[PDB]
Amino acid sequence: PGLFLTLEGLDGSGKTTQARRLAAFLEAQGRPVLLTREPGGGLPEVRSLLLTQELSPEAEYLLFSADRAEHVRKVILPGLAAGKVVISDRYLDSSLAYQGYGRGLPLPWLREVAREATRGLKPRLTFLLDLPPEAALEGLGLEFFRRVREGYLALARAEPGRFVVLDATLPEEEIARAIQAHLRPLLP
Amino acid sequence: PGLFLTLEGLDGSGKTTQARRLAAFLEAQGRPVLLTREPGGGLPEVRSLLLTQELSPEAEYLLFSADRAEHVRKVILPGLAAGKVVISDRYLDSSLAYQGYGRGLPLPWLREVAREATRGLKPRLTFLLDLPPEAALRGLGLEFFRRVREGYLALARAEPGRFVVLDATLPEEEIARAIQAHLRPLL
């Protein structure tokens, strides 16, 4: 039971605002909700480790993955088991976009790591707030953000049932209404 | 060129003393040497975090792997590139023994994770300091340690061209001499 939803996008895309808005919206309907986030929902100390100077992209991903593994096991799966709507502000797609398309790590390896880390748990829907890259860890420059932005769009084209792509430049309340509309058939 | 060697075993198996004796031997022969260790050779902060917290074995392994990825890139490969003999007290086999055999994680997955983390770097020889957990110099709790001990022995018998298994209960100087004898053909 339960319903697993995620929000994705660049830094500054509004996906945090929308995750919180959505949690409150659902709670106002009387639904049990668990709002969480990555990095840090699993292992809060990972945020310290991720700041390490000159971190290799492989190490970077492995840190995100350690947090994710703890997050899935200790937070998300137990929430879903209790019938909650679990909303994560970022999940595996963030790694695929940032560490895969951004840093250049091989997607198949990212997925193999992830398969045990996540126990195969995938969100039902993922709301991608698509932000122009100039409107957006070391080396987070414009070239990187272009790769990440386009990578997210690629992920969305590859799983077009799961991803809902939203124009992050729209007013926050219009974005929220669009998210709500996509959810109504799942949450009567 | 360099030469990459590792030491493995339970904590308190002497592998730490033997790493020091081996580096001293090599220093006496005028051979440049770098001694290092896991966890913490890559990300000290991982070592200190794992000292005081316990996680799922998957998360545990992924933290050891992040440390290892940094260790290989920033410490081991540069030492080998300079022509040093690099000796690590613990490497990937520790994860296989502790997280794999001990905590039950699947070995093929561990090895797939590792393949990128390590850039495929494997030691030329690994000295396993074998002893029962009750003999380690540093009972339901013993079951985990026996799984790890037996896991190391299983790793060793699968790769008899890489592992050298030593009686860790022997006197320290005798173990060191046996390590030296195994190494001399490779120098």
Ligand SMILES: Cc1cn([C@H]2C[C@H](O)[C@@H](COP(=O)(O)O)O2)c(=O)[nH]c1=O
């Ligand atoms: C979850 C996740 C986030 N990130 C990035 C997105 C943001 O730049 C940053 C999160 O920083 P924050 O903890 O300050 O919000 O980490 C990744 O690179 N990969 C991931 O897997």
Ligand SMILES: Cc1cn([C@H]2C[C@H](O)[C@@H](COP(=O)(O)O)O2)c(=O)[nH]c1=O
């Ligand atoms: C390198 C490594 C160590 N360990 C454990 C074995 C010991 O319990 C501990 C050694 O840490 P310490 O020597 O820093 O105290 O780390 C693993 O479980 N897996 C690993 O991959």
Ligand SMILES: [Cl-]
């Ligand atoms: Cl945001």
Ligand SMILES: [Cl-]
């Ligand atoms: Cl030891």
Ligand SMILES: [Mg+2]
């Ligand atoms: Mg992952």
Ligand SMILES: [Mg+2]
């Ligand atoms: Mg997601």
Ligand SMILES: [Mg+2]
């Ligand atoms: Mg794969």
Ligand SMILES: [Mg+2]
């Ligand atoms: Mg031990």
Ligand SMILES: [Mg+2]
């Ligand atoms: Mg590893």
Ligand SMILES: [Mg+2]
């Ligand atoms: Mg080894």
Ligand SMILES: [Mg+2]
């Ligand atoms: Mg065993």
Ligand SMILES: [Mg+2]
């Ligand atoms: Mg055995």
